[PDB]
Design a protein around this ligand. Structure first.
Ligand SMILES: OC[C@H]1O[C@@H](O[C@H]2[C@H](O)[C@@H](O)[C@H](O[C@@H]3[C@@H](O)[C@H](O[C@H]4[C@H](O)[C@@H](O)[C@H](O)O[C@@H]4CO)O[C@H](CO)[C@H]3O)O[C@@H]2CO)[C@H](O)[C@@H](O)[C@@H]1O
Ligand SMILES: [Cl-]
Length: 414
C-alpha cells in the first residue's frame, strides 16, 4: 500500500532525507511513502497541473507564498483537525499561522512544515581586515553603506582565489521572487501590496517603496556590487560566496548546514568562506527593521484516495519530533514554535542569530493572485537591474517602471 508525497529539494539528498524522516511512520502504520522531488523552478507548474487535472500525489509541499493560489482552486482538503491536534493557533508564530489558509478563508488548507528567513552571511576575515565592526555595519542603512565602502577599499585577498572580494553579491538577473528586495521596501516604510478602502492595491510606486528599492539598487550602481554579479542569478551568487568572491550576501539558514557538508556531498566545508562564516540580521531602515520570513507547508489534495493516512502523515510531519529531525537535515527552522528550543538550534551561534532575526520577520499576504502580483513586480524589477548595468538607474526611471508595474498589478487584482 502507498502514500505519494511531492517535495522540493530541501536538503543535499532530498528524497533520502525525506524517506529517513518518515521510516518510523511507515513502520507504525503499515504503509509505504513514495516521494517525488520537484525542482523549485518547475514545482509550481506540476502542482498546478495536478490541481486542475485531479492526477497527483496525496500530499504536496507548497511554498508558503503559494498556499493562497492553490487553495483558491478548491482542490485542498481542510486540515483544521490536523492543526488542532498539533496545538492550534497558539503553537505557531502569527507569520506561520497566516500561511495555513487563503487570506479571509475560514478553513485551514495547509499544515506548517518548516520556516526560513533571510539574513546576511559575511566573511569574518574580510570585515576584520577592512576594519569594519559588524554590529555597526548591520545596524542601519548608513552603517551598511559605510561598511561596504571600507570593504571596497580593502587590499584583503581570498587565500584560495588570491583576488579581492566583492563587498556585496546580489543577483541582478530578473529574479523569480521579491525575497531579496522586500526587506529594503519594508525598511523604508513601503509595501508590495496594501489593503485599504475595501481592496488590495500595489504600493510598489509609493515614495517609501521607491526610497528602499532605490537604496538597494543604487548599492550596485556605486561599485559595491561588481558588474559580474548583475549578470548572475541566486544559485550563481551562492556559488560565488562559497568560492571566496563575496564578503557579504543575503540567504536563508540552509547555508549554515551546506557549510558543514564537504564539497563532494554538495556542501562547502573545505572552503575559506565556511571557515570564516558570520551571520548578521538585515539592518534597520528609516522606518524599521524587517526581513523576508518564509518556509513551506504541506497540503492534502481533496481527490486523494488516502485522506485518513495522509492526515496521520501531516500530523507526524507537523509534530515536534519530526520538526526537529527534518530541520536538522535541511538547515531550516521548525514551523512549530516549541521546537526552536532544541539544543541543535540553540547551541549553533549562527542559527541563534536567525532565531533572533525572526522578531523582524515579515510575510506576504496569502492572496489567490499572489503569483501574478510577484511575477509582474519581478519583471519590472529586472528592467530596473538592466538600467543599473548601464549606470542609468535614476529615481525617475525607477518610478516610471514601478508606476507601470502598479498599473498592471492593480489591473490583475480586479
Ligand atoms: O518563492 C517560492 C517559495 O520560496 C521559498 O524559498 C526557497 C527558494 O524558493 C528556493 O529556491 C531555495 O532553494 C534552496 C536551493 O537553492 C539550495 O541549492 C543548493 C545546491 O543544492 C548546491 O549545489 C549549491 O552549490 O548550493 C545551493 C545552496 O545550498 O539548496 C537549499 C537546500 O540545501 C534549498 O532550500 O529554498 C528556499 C527555502 O525553501 C520560500 O521559503 C517560500 O516562502 C516561497 O513560497
Ligand atoms: Cl507586502
Amino acid at each position: 500500500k502507498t502514500l505519494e508525497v511531492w517535495i522540493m529539494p530541501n536538503s543535499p539528498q532530498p528524497a533520502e532525507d525525506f524517506k529517513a524522516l518518515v521510516a518510523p511512520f511507515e513502520k507504525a502504520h503499515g504503509v509505504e511513502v513514495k516521494v517525488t522531488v520537484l525542482d523549485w523552478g518547475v514545482a509550481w507548474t506540476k502542482i498546478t497541473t495536478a490541481a486542475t487535472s485531479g492526477v497527483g500525489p496525496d500530499l504536496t509541499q507548497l511554498g508558503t507564498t503559494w498556499v493562497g493560489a492553490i487553495s483558491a482552486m478548491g482542490v485542498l482538503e481542510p486540515v483544521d483537525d490536523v492543526l488542532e491536534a498539533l496545538g492550534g493557533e497558539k503553537a505557531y508564530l502569527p507569520a506561520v499561522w497566516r500561511t495555513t489558509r487563503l487570506e479571509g478563508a475560514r478553513q485551514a488548507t495547509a499544515v506548517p512544515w518548516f520556516s526560513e528567513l533571510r539574513a546576511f552571511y559575511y566573511r569574518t576575515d574580510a570585515l576584520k581586515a577592512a576594519g569594519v565592526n559588524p554590529a555597526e555595519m548591520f545596524a542601519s542603512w548608513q552603517g551598511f553603506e559605510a561598511g561596504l565602502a571600507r570593504l571596497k577599499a580593502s587590499s584583503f585577498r581570498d587565500p584560495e582565489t588570491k583576488a579581492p572580494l566583492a563587498p556585496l553579491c546580489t543577483p541582478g538577473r530578473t529574479p523569480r521572487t521579491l525575497h531579496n528586495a522586500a526587506p529594503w521596501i519594508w525598511g523604508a516604510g513601503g509595501e508590495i501590496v496594501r489593503q485599504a478602502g475595501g481592496r488590495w492595491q500595489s504600493a510598489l510606486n509609493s515614495p517609501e517603496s521607491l526610497e528602499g528599492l532605490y537604496f538597494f539598487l543604487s548599492l550596485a550602481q556605486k561599485g559595491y556590487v561588481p558588474a559580474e554579479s548583475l549578470e548572475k542569478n541566486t544559485a550563481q551568487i551562492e556559488a560565488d560566496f562559497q568560492a571566496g568572491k563575496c564578503a557579504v550576501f543575503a540567504s536563508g539558514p540552509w547555508m549554515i548546514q551546506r557549510a558543514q557538508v564537504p564539497e563532494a556531498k554538495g556542501g562547502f566545508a573545505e572552503r575559506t568562506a565556511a571557515k570564516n562564516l558570520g551571520v548578521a540580521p538585515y539592518p534597520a531602515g528609516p522606518k524599521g527593521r524587517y526581513t523576508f520570513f518564509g518556509g513551506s507547508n504541506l497540503a492534502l489534495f481533496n481527490f486523494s484516495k488516502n485522506k485518513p493516512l495522509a492526515k496521520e502523515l501531516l500530523k507526524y510531519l507537523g509534530g515536534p519530533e519530526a520538526q526537529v529531525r527534518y530541520a536538522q537535515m535541511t538547515g531550516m527552522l521548525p514551523a512549530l514554535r516549541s521546537a526552536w528550543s532544541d539544543p541543535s538550534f540553540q547551541q549553533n551561534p549562527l542559527l541563534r542569530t536567525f532565531i533572533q532575526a525572526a522578531q523582524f520577520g515579515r510575510t506576504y499576504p496569502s492572496l489567490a493572485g499572489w503569483g501574478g502580483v510577484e511575477n509582474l513586480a519581478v519583471q519590472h524589477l529586472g528592467m530596473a537591474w538592466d538600467l543599473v548595468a548601464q549606470g542609468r538607474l535614476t529615481r525617475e526611471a525607477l518610478k516610471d517602471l514601478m508606476d507601470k508595474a502598479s498599473a498592471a498589478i492593480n489591473q490583475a487584482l480586479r
